[model samples]
Target: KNMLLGGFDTGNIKAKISFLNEKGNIESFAIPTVIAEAPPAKIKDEDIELLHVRIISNSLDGDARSRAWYVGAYAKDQEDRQEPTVDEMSQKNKKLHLIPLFTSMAVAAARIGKEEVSVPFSGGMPILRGEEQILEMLYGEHTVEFLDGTYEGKKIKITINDGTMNVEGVSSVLAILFDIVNGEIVEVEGMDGESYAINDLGAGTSDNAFFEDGELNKKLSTNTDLGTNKYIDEILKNIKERFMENSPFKTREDFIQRLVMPEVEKMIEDDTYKPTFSVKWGPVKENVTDIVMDGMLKYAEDQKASLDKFWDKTNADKNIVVGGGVLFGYAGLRDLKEQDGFILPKNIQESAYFTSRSYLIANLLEQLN
Candidate 1:
């Protein structure tokens, strides 16, 4: 495999998969965490019975018959309309349970490196000649035999058999430590005189952990309700108030699907693009660039305050290491950097790939003799 190691970050909004190729290069992909299923359909008696079915809501090529659903989005589609709730969606679709794991393997397979040297063929095909066994041992089998079930009158089937791994909360902590070990991330001096503090801002929750010279400081590590979703909500509310009739958004999901997602790509490509909204409805001329920055700056201030309390409670030093999907919004981090005592890493583009880098490091470390 081209990938010497692999990792995953299964966030509330999206899933990211990363691989460290054999040549020591990093590659990653991000996809929506959403999954949905259509109602059950009739099948031939001779056809294999299915227990799970997976659907990627972002897919455009497939038939529109079985409209896909999303996980974190507040709206769920039902018969050409939206339900405005994700509660039933999760409970109804069992295949959503396997998505994080399955996507991880899928990304790995896409990036996995092939052997530079070719094997000789015996007859019509390259005779594995015992090498097949080695290949099996190294890459393992893509088995989803266990992710099976029924959902909402539909017989779900695990058609694509593959591996999976769920990366969340403490999993990221472990992965970060692996990066520290592999020199991908450097450790900082702790206020407590012995540990390093890691503040991770994510979609669902913000996490803060203490590391004592690269080892987890279990007592000081914890998760908080603060996350990027709060900012997204605030931005949407501001847009609604600013644009009034010209908002062009009936719901947060609508805004995300139409404007926010496309804007994110722009931000990723051009550093000059500020996080703002331009509503195109009934002649309402509103530019909320300042509003977006102000709101996020306050959010950053609040995050810093929270981090301060944690440092005092743990008696750790002022030096803090931070990352998360929220940082992808360059405006927020730009404000936070002005504050003292916080150490933001250089080349924060890596932070966008944080979980993936950690996962790749973890994989490599596990292989060391």
Candidate 2:
């Protein structure tokens, strides 16, 4: 199995740009070709960073590869029901699941970077690297959408509004492709100067008909069953209000009590809190605790504070597990502590796992139908 995009894989990206002279023809982008050595074990250690520019290629072939790794990781989790947790998502298992796509992109990024120059070949080649880079570098809105289009196989759609890109599709592979080519169209003047037309480096076919009735606007979906005539519409716009805002916490109660109360108040500085989450109990007990339970609560009452202090001191900064079992929240994790014997270890795997799980929630649900 390939390694996850940790350490140097996602970080160390070197580019030797082929200089363009006063004459606007093609001089050199890099060399005749470029190659990406296997990213060492550590990105920070390797001092690696990736530029989001697609200078040499028409379609974002490189960007698509990187994105494939991202979408593939999510699809694997959604498939296995292994909800992620924490922030950076450095978990090994999660990364293990994510490597399939990330690995593919690593190769793609290298290839795109290595190539001399790429001319767009088709209509939907998933090429948006330059746009994404410019938007981000220039503080432009890095908008994404469930763009609509019909291919022989699947139907894909993307929408970006309120300064967000909401994407939903079945296959992660298709989603990766959709992600690359979603919203990339810039008006450039023709060679004659007076004439203006679409300059899709990736679009080999100059069939302007696709752009006539918003045909080019709609891309393909993950559902391969959808035919080419199927016109996907860019309807129901929703913005990704939370860009890397952590994923929803485990359980409804925790979301309200822990996340909303503390996080929201910090942002708004408003003490007032409300509960938007509700749970259904089979039935309310006449008395929540029987005499035996009351005895336990009494026994633990004196010990709770000290135990809390101990947990706080020990877990000052540690990585915990992230998955379905922990996401259930209190009921899910309460048992991990037996008379104050809970485990809290810190490591890259643990930290990444913990964070990505939460962010994934927002990432996946950023847009809806």
Candidate 3:
């Protein structure tokens, strides 16, 4: 079987897997970045035998039992068709079945590539070496399957490694460099003149970097807390105002996760999905649309300000290419492209999966040596 390469990014606590399948077809998978504790005893339903199950973002910090709440809910919903509560998640028992949910998803994808060919797996992670502890926890070996036929019905152990890790910003920069070098991206008038700037408006961080003829200009590259989360917050604030007098949602996070996120998802999937908000009383739906759009415009403007300073630190009028989840907030690239001094390269639109695609290509070639 031919060796395979994979790339993963933990954005939104949901890991994005990018790889080329056996037929050399590009594929991606979004696995919810969560885990819940399983029951200790074997269950009637063999499918739910594992003690831990994959869940959406349900816990923060290192609370193991807290993670189990989602599992309990799933179990109750499956067996008795009863609703589970957060309080129920704390109780622990011997029946818990544990598995490396995240690692398993990765292996499942890698296994397909390996089945057609025999070679070591080369994977790329959008995590810096600074997070070695998380890297170890995630990539370490763990018992997964209940029984392994290859091992005569014994427990199956899964390990994920044999790859490279780096800051997501660096990955984006490398991909941008390749696009420019290969003529996939046409450099603007001021681009490649001393310093080229890249603005990566990611989910967690908005990072900026300058390159000189495809080389990193280390001194100018910097990361900021500004990202898609800020825009989400902006939307949340508007949602809160609608419920200022009689709020239906309990918390801001819950509100966003339950309501706003779905709306945003729809918008991304369909450009014709017009955003609207309505209730039994208060501001009309049209007013809601106005508020949402107004907030989004302001958010984009603030992002422009941040990018302006980022470029100003190096060259006031440098060609800046941008990518990341944050781009979803803008109606289009019109305003961003209009920014003076800083030119938002048209090629940035081609960089949706740039980082992941770059990693897969690099790793696949490395195996050829």
Candidate 4:
């Protein structure tokens, strides 16, 4: 069975995939969770540089699968677009996950130079509330055609077993407990017999679980929709009320990537790093330092509530926070760290994929078993 083991972190904001390449190295890529319609092109593919991939796939809905719709930044660049995901149940209902899901597999397949692949998939959700639907959704025969790209004229077949899926932080435990070296899995000791708390502050959901005896203690695990978006919303609302309702930065993707996340990252490395941004507002520019801080402060409160509400993590020996959300409010969410037995990835980038990387390790173990 030449089934390639892979992890698909199907986050609401982005779809991240990690797979073992032919060289026995872990390779991964992420695409934004946005899709848009594509009009017929007047010029030929040979006439111009690559056009963002427009795809046709049976995995997507009839309305979506039949047409060559753009994915990721290609979709985001469109004048009119859609962020097909809204909440937990909505993802399955809309079948929006299908776009990024298949697109990611196709990308991996292209790298492998295989027209067809059998991928034993590992994935995760904020909660297992829709576990059955998702498993059923994931298990099946799928086909994808990259209508335009270097992989042009290629139609790849992807077969996914109703393989293992992770509860947000469940596989994250595996990720943290295990490490990869020279393409091998090495057990990360210390937490083997101890219990530690993990919180994945995702874009749309926050997932937390405790690890003990090297297994997930579901009793201490829970999920919530109150993710960093709430904090982003805090900043957006303040800007709209103070700046303009139709502000060009209507979508915070660029704002966060260009201005905000870096500051959060800097602060994570340097305690003295203060958040600052002089973003454009209409024709003039304005400093959004305090405005942005308000949101992060609010998110910090909600994050603490989510962590403590289910059960005081104080029972655990240590608390680790991971996810892109941590990028923005790594502190108030400061100051939570000032407490004993607290830690986050020092690299800052590691925090973003810690959970997904854990999910990948889970895939590796499943293959080994």
Candidate topping lDDT: 4
Best by TM-score: 4
The Cα local distance difference test for each model comes to 0.47, 0.21, 0.46, 0.67
lDDT string, candidate 2, 41-106, tens digits: 212111011211111111223332222121221222233322323245122232322232122223
TM-score for each model: 0.59, 0.18, 0.58, 0.76
TM-score, cand. 4: 0.76
Q: What does candidate 3's lDDT look like per residue over 1-369, in tens digits?
A: 334455554443334555666555545543333334344323312222222332222212344422322222123234422221223311231112122233334344334523222223333333233445434444434333322112112233344455555433344444444432222332443333455676766655676777665556667877766766666666657655766644444433344445455665566556688866443234533235566566566767777777778766877346554644444445443355565655543344434455555555555545555
Cα displacement (angstroms), candidate 4, residue 334, comes to 5.1
Q: What's the true lDDT of residue 227 in model 3?
A: 62
Worst 10 residues of 3 by lDDT: 89-98
Q: Model 2: runs farther than 4 Å from truth?
A: 1-99, 103-275, 278-324, 331-338, 345-369
lDDT for model 4: 0.67
Model 4: per-residue Cα lDDT over 1-369, one tens digit each: 446657788766788877766776666667778776665431311211233444454456656656666777667767877776443555443445677677778777877778678877787754345765667766677776777766767777888765766643356666655555535666443333266777788877887767775467766666778677767876777776766533637466667777786787677668887668667766767777888887887888777777665446537777777777777676577676566666665445556777667777888777768
Per-candidate total of colliding backbone pairs = 15, 50, 15, 2
